[PDB]
C-alpha cells in the first residue's frame, strides 16, 4: 500500500525519459537507412548504332 507504490512512482520519470530516447532512436535509424537509388538504363545511342549497322550502312 505504501512502499512499493512510492518506488514505482520514483521510477516513472527515468523510464519515461529512456523510452522516449529509444523511440527517437528507432525513428533516427529509420531515416538513416533511406538513400535515393538512381538506376542506369542502356544508352539509346548504342541502339541507334545497332540500327545503323543492321541497315548495312
Amino acid at each position: 500500500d505504501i512502499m512499493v507504490p512510492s518506488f514505482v512512482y520514483n521510477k516513472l520519470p527515468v523510464i519515461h525519459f529512456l523510452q522516449e530516447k529509444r523511440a527517437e532512436q528507432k525513428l533516427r535509424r529509420v531515416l538513416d537507412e533511406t538513400y535515393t537509388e538512381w538506376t542506369e538504363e542502356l544508352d539509346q545511342a548504342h541502339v541507334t548504332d545497332a540500327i545503323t549497322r543492321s541497315l548495312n550502312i
Binding site: 512512482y9 520514483n10 520519470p13 527515468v14 519515461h16 525519459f17
Partner: protein, 87 residues
C-alpha cells in the same frame, strides 16, 4: 485555475537530483518537476531547496484524435488490474 495537485516530487530539487536529466529544462533554466514540459517551474529555498510547478491556463495546439486502432492494445488479462481500478 484549479487547486489540484500535480506530479509528485517528494520534496526534491530536480536541478540537483541524481536523475535530473530525466526532467526537461525550460528556457529559464529550471528543470521540470515532471516528465512533462513546464513553462513556469520555480525553485523555493527553505532549509532545503525544492522545485514547484504552478498550474495555469495555457493553450496547446491539440493534434486531432487518432483512430482507436493505432493506440488501443487489447492484451488485457484476467489478473490485470488498471491503476484507476486499483486507486
Amino acid at each position: 485555475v484549479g487547486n489540484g495537485p500535480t506530479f509528485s516530487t517528494g520534496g526534491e530539487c530536480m536541478n540537483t537530483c541524481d536523475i535530473q536529466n530525466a526532467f526537461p529544462m525550460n528556457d529559464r533554466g529550471v528543470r521540470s518537476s515532471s516528465p512533462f514540459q513546464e513553462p513556469n517551474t520555480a525553485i523555493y529555498d527553505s532549509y532545503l531547496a525544492w522545485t514547484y510547478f504552478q498550474p495555469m491556463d495555457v493553450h496547446i495546439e491539440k493534434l486531432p484524435a487518432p483512430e482507436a486502432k493505432y493506440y488501443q492494445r487489447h492484451t488485457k488479462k484476467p489478473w490485470d488490474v488498471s491503476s484507476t481500478e486499483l486507486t
